[PDB]
């Protein structure tokens, strides 16, 4: 309870990264202190692929994309994703998007 206020500023890279971390944070398995824009998952964290599919899928949802295992596998850091997002630069582009 106890409501206050919480707006949602424009959409900028600052949001992608934060999200990349935020999402990674949501994962108790992944510690925030250790977590870092430049922090591996298997070299540092030491997670398993089973976690990679998740972490990735997390970004695919948090951003709403379709990252193939061929990519998710190439992604071993949070910054690596940001790049994938930044590129997308908003998903307000035409296309057959159904609910």
PDB file of C-alpha atoms in Angstrom:
ATOM      1  CA  UNK A   1       0.000   0.000   0.000  1.00  0.00           C
ATOM      2  CA  UNK A   2       1.032   3.580   0.667  1.00  0.00           C
ATOM      3  CA  UNK A   3       0.941   5.107  -2.796  1.00  0.00           C
ATOM      4  CA  UNK A   4       2.823   8.198  -3.903  1.00  0.00           C
ATOM      5  CA  UNK A   5       3.997   8.917  -7.428  1.00  0.00           C
ATOM      6  CA  UNK A   6       5.971   7.231 -10.182  1.00  0.00           C
ATOM      7  CA  UNK A   7       6.229   8.497 -13.740  1.00  0.00           C
ATOM      8  CA  UNK A   8       7.834   6.920 -16.782  1.00  0.00           C
ATOM      9  CA  UNK A   9      10.345   9.282 -18.429  1.00  0.00           C
ATOM     10  CA  UNK A  10      11.075   9.155 -22.183  1.00  0.00           C
ATOM     11  CA  UNK A  11      12.673   6.122 -23.803  1.00  0.00           C
ATOM     12  CA  UNK A  12      16.449   6.359 -23.945  1.00  0.00           C
ATOM     13  CA  UNK A  13      19.484   4.104 -23.780  1.00  0.00           C
ATOM     14  CA  UNK A  14      19.676   5.061 -20.122  1.00  0.00           C
ATOM     15  CA  UNK A  15      16.532   2.965 -19.892  1.00  0.00           C
ATOM     16  CA  UNK A  16      17.863   0.009 -21.844  1.00  0.00           C
ATOM     17  CA  UNK A  17      20.907  -0.450 -19.643  1.00  0.00           C
ATOM     18  CA  UNK A  18      19.111   0.199 -16.375  1.00  0.00           C
ATOM     19  CA  UNK A  19      16.587  -2.347 -17.588  1.00  0.00           C
ATOM     20  CA  UNK A  20      19.326  -4.780 -18.542  1.00  0.00           C
ATOM     21  CA  UNK A  21      20.552  -4.542 -14.969  1.00  0.00           C
ATOM     22  CA  UNK A  22      17.145  -4.149 -13.366  1.00  0.00           C
ATOM     23  CA  UNK A  23      15.963  -7.313 -15.074  1.00  0.00           C
ATOM     24  CA  UNK A  24      19.184  -9.054 -14.112  1.00  0.00           C
ATOM     25  CA  UNK A  25      18.639  -7.753 -10.601  1.00  0.00           C
ATOM     26  CA  UNK A  26      15.121  -9.136 -10.411  1.00  0.00           C
ATOM     27  CA  UNK A  27      16.985 -12.425 -10.611  1.00  0.00           C
ATOM     28  CA  UNK A  28      17.955 -13.225  -7.042  1.00  0.00           C
ATOM     29  CA  UNK A  29      20.292 -15.798  -8.541  1.00  0.00           C
ATOM     30  CA  UNK A  30      22.140 -12.832  -9.994  1.00  0.00           C
ATOM     31  CA  UNK A  31      23.643 -10.538  -7.386  1.00  0.00           C
ATOM     32  CA  UNK A  32      23.509  -6.777  -8.040  1.00  0.00           C
ATOM     33  CA  UNK A  33      26.839  -5.952  -6.424  1.00  0.00           C
ATOM     34  CA  UNK A  34      28.609  -8.433  -8.668  1.00  0.00           C
ATOM     35  CA  UNK A  35      26.326  -7.620 -11.574  1.00  0.00           C
ATOM     36  CA  UNK A  36      27.841  -5.047 -13.899  1.00  0.00           C
ATOM     37  CA  UNK A  37      27.301  -3.729 -17.407  1.00  0.00           C
ATOM     38  CA  UNK A  38      30.631  -5.424 -18.015  1.00  0.00           C
ATOM     39  CA  UNK A  39      30.175  -8.552 -15.934  1.00  0.00           C
ATOM     40  CA  UNK A  40      30.165 -12.017 -17.458  1.00  0.00           C
ATOM     41  CA  UNK A  41      27.624 -14.626 -16.428  1.00  0.00           C
ATOM     42  CA  UNK A  42      29.753 -17.750 -16.593  1.00  0.00           C
ATOM     43  CA  UNK A  43      33.197 -16.210 -16.270  1.00  0.00           C
ATOM     44  CA  UNK A  44      32.159 -14.034 -13.352  1.00  0.00           C
ATOM     45  CA  UNK A  45      28.734 -14.986 -12.051  1.00  0.00           C
ATOM     46  CA  UNK A  46      29.230 -18.582 -13.125  1.00  0.00           C
ATOM     47  CA  UNK A  47      25.648 -19.300 -14.111  1.00  0.00           C
ATOM     48  CA  UNK A  48      24.384 -22.045 -16.391  1.00  0.00           C
ATOM     49  CA  UNK A  49      22.904 -21.931 -19.873  1.00  0.00           C
ATOM     50  CA  UNK A  50      19.545 -22.678 -18.297  1.00  0.00           C
ATOM     51  CA  UNK A  51      20.016 -19.240 -16.787  1.00  0.00           C
ATOM     52  CA  UNK A  52      21.210 -17.757 -20.059  1.00  0.00           C
ATOM     53  CA  UNK A  53      17.985 -18.681 -21.811  1.00  0.00           C
ATOM     54  CA  UNK A  54      16.117 -16.975 -18.996  1.00  0.00           C
ATOM     55  CA  UNK A  55      18.219 -13.845 -18.666  1.00  0.00           C
ATOM     56  CA  UNK A  56      17.962 -13.445 -22.420  1.00  0.00           C
ATOM     57  CA  UNK A  57      14.258 -14.210 -22.544  1.00  0.00           C
ATOM     58  CA  UNK A  58      13.985 -11.574 -19.843  1.00  0.00           C
ATOM     59  CA  UNK A  59      15.321  -8.959 -22.232  1.00  0.00           C
ATOM     60  CA  UNK A  60      13.243 -10.327 -25.085  1.00  0.00           C
ATOM     61  CA  UNK A  61      10.203  -9.553 -22.969  1.00  0.00           C
ATOM     62  CA  UNK A  62      11.385  -6.452 -21.146  1.00  0.00           C
ATOM     63  CA  UNK A  63      11.988  -5.088 -24.624  1.00  0.00           C
ATOM     64  CA  UNK A  64       9.734  -7.375 -26.630  1.00  0.00           C
ATOM     65  CA  UNK A  65      12.037  -9.003 -29.155  1.00  0.00           C
ATOM     66  CA  UNK A  66      13.026 -12.367 -30.579  1.00  0.00           C
ATOM     67  CA  UNK A  67      16.634 -13.239 -29.840  1.00  0.00           C
ATOM     68  CA  UNK A  68      17.581 -16.650 -31.278  1.00  0.00           C
ATOM     69  CA  UNK A  69      19.757 -19.144 -29.428  1.00  0.00           C
ATOM     70  CA  UNK A  70      22.357 -18.233 -32.023  1.00  0.00           C
ATOM     71  CA  UNK A  71      22.360 -14.771 -30.495  1.00  0.00           C
ATOM     72  CA  UNK A  72      21.502 -15.529 -26.887  1.00  0.00           C
ATOM     73  CA  UNK A  73      24.573 -17.736 -27.061  1.00  0.00           C
ATOM     74  CA  UNK A  74      26.650 -14.875 -28.412  1.00  0.00           C
ATOM     75  CA  UNK A  75      25.386 -12.815 -25.500  1.00  0.00           C
ATOM     76  CA  UNK A  76      27.469 -13.360 -22.386  1.00  0.00           C
ATOM     77  CA  UNK A  77      27.098  -9.930 -20.831  1.00  0.00           C
ATOM     78  CA  UNK A  78      24.414  -7.300 -20.145  1.00  0.00           C
ATOM     79  CA  UNK A  79      26.128  -4.664 -22.265  1.00  0.00           C
ATOM     80  CA  UNK A  80      26.097  -7.077 -25.181  1.00  0.00           C
ATOM     81  CA  UNK A  81      22.319  -6.925 -25.015  1.00  0.00           C
ATOM     82  CA  UNK A  82      22.071  -3.166 -24.644  1.00  0.00           C
ATOM     83  CA  UNK A  83      23.806  -2.999 -28.004  1.00  0.00           C
ATOM     84  CA  UNK A  84      21.167  -5.312 -29.423  1.00  0.00           C
ATOM     85  CA  UNK A  85      18.488  -3.066 -27.976  1.00  0.00           C
ATOM     86  CA  UNK A  86      20.018   0.297 -28.802  1.00  0.00           C
ATOM     87  CA  UNK A  87      20.166  -0.904 -32.387  1.00  0.00           C
ATOM     88  CA  UNK A  88      16.476  -1.740 -32.310  1.00  0.00           C
ATOM     89  CA  UNK A  89      15.985   1.805 -31.079  1.00  0.00           C
ATOM     90  CA  UNK A  90      12.361   1.511 -30.028  1.00  0.00           C
ATOM     91  CA  UNK A  91      10.051  -1.058 -31.574  1.00  0.00           C
ATOM     92  CA  UNK A  92       7.553   1.498 -32.820  1.00  0.00           C
ATOM     93  CA  UNK A  93       8.079   0.311 -36.376  1.00  0.00           C
ATOM     94  CA  UNK A  94       5.456  -1.101 -38.709  1.00  0.00           C
ATOM     95  CA  UNK A  95       4.997  -4.848 -38.987  1.00  0.00           C
ATOM     96  CA  UNK A  96       2.449  -7.649 -38.481  1.00  0.00           C
ATOM     97  CA  UNK A  97       2.181  -7.399 -34.708  1.00  0.00           C
ATOM     98  CA  UNK A  98      -0.856  -9.151 -33.281  1.00  0.00           C
ATOM     99  CA  UNK A  99      -1.976  -9.569 -29.689  1.00  0.00           C
TER     100      UNK A  99
END
